[PDB]
Amino acid sequence: KKAVINGEQIRSISDLHQTLKKELALPEYYGENLDALWDALTGWVEYPLVLEWRQFEQSKQLTENGAESVLQVFREAKAEGADITIILS
Structure with missing residues (x-):
């Protein structure tokens, strides 16, 4: 997949968890951290991915x-x- 982090719109990390939850396509209970994210990428996201x-x-x-x-x-x-x-970059 192709994930994209836009800090130009990210008001706070809150919008970040949504940008990863939107690109990676995480569920609702998504921890929104390195535990649920790592748990996702390493068993949820579809590679090859583009962060x-x-x-x-x-x-x-x-x-x-x-x-x-x-x-x-x-x-x-x-x-x-x-x-x-x-x-x-």
């Missing part, structure tokens, strides 16, 4: 580790075995 993380600054410093976490997982998937392309 085009646009503005990774906004939303990331606005919290403590929401964007940097969904990312530690996205990358953890393309690393361990997942076939995801984590982009940030």
Whole structure:
């Protein structure tokens, strides 16, 4: 699939969990964190996936580790075995 993080519209990590829940297509109980996300990517999302993380600054410093976490997982998937392309530029 092709996920895309738009920090230009992400008001807070709240919209982030929705952007991943929208691209990855997560369910309602979606933990919206590195646990449910990692649980998803590693058993929910469809690879090869494209995590085009646009503005990774906004939303990331606005919290403590929401964007940097969904990312530690996205990358953890393309690393361990997942076939995801984590982009940030």
